[PDB]
Design a protein around this ligand. Structure first.
Ligand code: FAD
Length: 471
């Protein structure tokens, strides 16, 4: 492409980083990357479990059989008759290419798997090594932009502390600029004909929860304070359709910090902790009470009903075998005092359980006996407890509680990632796209673990590819 006005990408999470890289590297289309925060990555950089992909090289290497058809099956079942099926088809059918794109263009290994709740096979990818997936992916894609900027600063500029407040359109009805407030609070205009909203969800905003799902306003959240639904409100005022805004995902296992128990913000206890073998104990009786590997809305519903109405939490318990397959993450969690290594005798007393140590041993040995039917029908039991566990054996334990986590609703988009005008099938504007958590319809009533990072790559690349046909 010959250089014209920049494409403005709003948000430096995975959606924005994907859009930016695809635009610069494949077509030489110049980018200005705005973010209202003081650092890159949003909630993407916090991602812990990984990114989904169906029929990958990694699944081939590990001899798991998976297809775009099966992924779509699990996705449709999780959505519960909400959402937009061609978006669910597109997400699962492009998942192979998304994984391969990260592998070949950035040398991200993504060589390990985990099976999360509501998945029929393991398909959530992470790389071996010391870096969790959200940080490793964001670091790689953002470093490439800085490398490119360093050789040609007019090809990409990253402008942090820049809050978009509106899009200016001409008499009818095309993009001419993006209005933003700079670091000093001064109103600025970036002239452009193309904008991609990659600005994230709205889970942090109590004001918007009160409007779209008021029952959740007292819950704590995993979301960064920047997660305030800005893009959703801007595009709605400009005439865009919003969909599924009342579908808010409450994640069942946010960590309780024992020295900060009532912080509205929680570290997340990754769903990979359960898929890789973790179980949940009731915090008074000390017994298992639910299928830990169901979808997030179901686990949350089980905790909120079966655990105490006041003090609504649970103990996430993980074996040594879990630890050996998730070592660096659990070491991190322990560094924040969120997970403790404790003998079973001491487990009973520090958590004031009703079960005896010998009784808990008997339960754990039964749980780990794959030849006995699981009480709660758990579909995958791996990395369980040693057949000769005793009351002096050690386990890893944290306290967890449900948290507002992800907003399935957002602005209506199509398969080209273009924003849909209210009450229409026509795009709101030739030059307005959206990608990632800011958009609605991809997940319906519940998002499967691992699918939002995936959504960012799939629809970030798509917006970039379709802008190139219009630049
Ligand atoms: C702790 C945590 C762990 C997670 N782990 C996983 C996982 O393992 N697998 C998975 O699939 N999903 C995971 N998720 C969900 C997923 O990471 C997020 O949905 C993902 O970050 C969405 O990417 P995004 O690019 O749309 O938004 P974000 O990553 O949130 O980026 C949005 C950016 O837009 C910026 N912004 C907001 N408003 C403006 C504005 N007006 N102007 C300019 N910039 C603005 C924000 O500051 C932010 O940086 C996790 C989420 C959290 C909170």
């Amino acid at each position: 492409a010959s250089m014209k006005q920049p494409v403005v990408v709003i948000g430096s999470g995975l959606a924005g980083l994907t859009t930016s890289n695809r635009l610069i590297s494949k077509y030489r289309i110049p980018v200005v990357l705005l973010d209202k925060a003081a650092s890159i990555g949003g909630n993407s950089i916090k991602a812990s479990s990984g990114i989904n992909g169906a029929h990958t090289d990694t699944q081939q290497n590990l001899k798991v059989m998976d297809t775009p058809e099966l992924f779509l099956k699990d996705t449709l079942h999780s959505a519960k008759g909400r959402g937009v099926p061609s978006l669910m088809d597109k997400l699962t059918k492009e998942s192979k290419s998304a994984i391969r794109w990260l592998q070949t263009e950035f040398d991200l290994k993504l060589d390990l798997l985990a099976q999360l709740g509501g998945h029929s096979v393991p398909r959530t990818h992470r790389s071996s090594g010391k870096l969790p997936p959200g940080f490793e992916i964001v670091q790689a894609l953002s470093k490439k932009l800085k490398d490119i900027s360093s050789k040609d600063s007019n090809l990409v500029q990253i402008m942090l502390n820049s809050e978009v407040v509106d899009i200016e359109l001409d008499n009818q009805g095309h993009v001419t600029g993006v209005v933003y407030m700079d670091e000093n609070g001064n109103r600025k205009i970036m002239k452009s004909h193309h904008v991609v909203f990659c600005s994230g969800g709205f889970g942090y905003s109590k004001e918007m929860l009160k409007e779209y799902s008021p029952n959740l306003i007292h819950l704590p959240t995993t979301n960064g304070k920047q997660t305030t639904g800005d893009g959703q409100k801007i595009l709605s005022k400009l005439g865009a359709e919003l969909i599924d805004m009342d579908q808010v995902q409450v994640h069942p296992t946010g960590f309780i910090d024992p020295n900060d128990r009532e912080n509205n913000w929680k570290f997340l206890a990754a769903e990979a902790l359960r898929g890789l073998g973790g179980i949940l104990l009731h915090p008074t009786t000390g017994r298992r009470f639910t299928n830990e590997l169901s979808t997030a809305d179901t686990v949350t519903m089980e905790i909120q009903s079966k655990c105490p109405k006041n003090d609504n939490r649970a103990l996430l318990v993980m074996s040594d075998k879990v630890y050996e397959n998730y070592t660096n993450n659990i070491n991190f969690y322990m560094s924040k005092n969120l997970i403790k290594k404790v003998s079973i005798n001491d487990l009973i007393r520090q958590y004031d359980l009703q079960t005896t140590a010998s009784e808990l041993v008997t339960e754990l040995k039964s749980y780990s006996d794959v030849n006995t039917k699981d009480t709660f029908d758990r579909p995958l039991i791996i990395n369980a407890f040693d057949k000769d566990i005793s009351t002096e054996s050690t386990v890893y334990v944290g306290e967890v509680t449900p948290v507002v986590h992800f907003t399935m609703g957002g602005v209506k988009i199509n398969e080209k990632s273009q924003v849909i005008k209210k009450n229409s099938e026509s795009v709101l504007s030739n030059g307005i796209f959206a990608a990632g958590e800011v958009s609605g319809g991809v997940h319906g009533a519940n998002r499967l673990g691992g699918s939002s990072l995936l959504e960012c790559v799939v629809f970030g690349k798509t917006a970039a590819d379709n802008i190139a046909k219009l630049y």
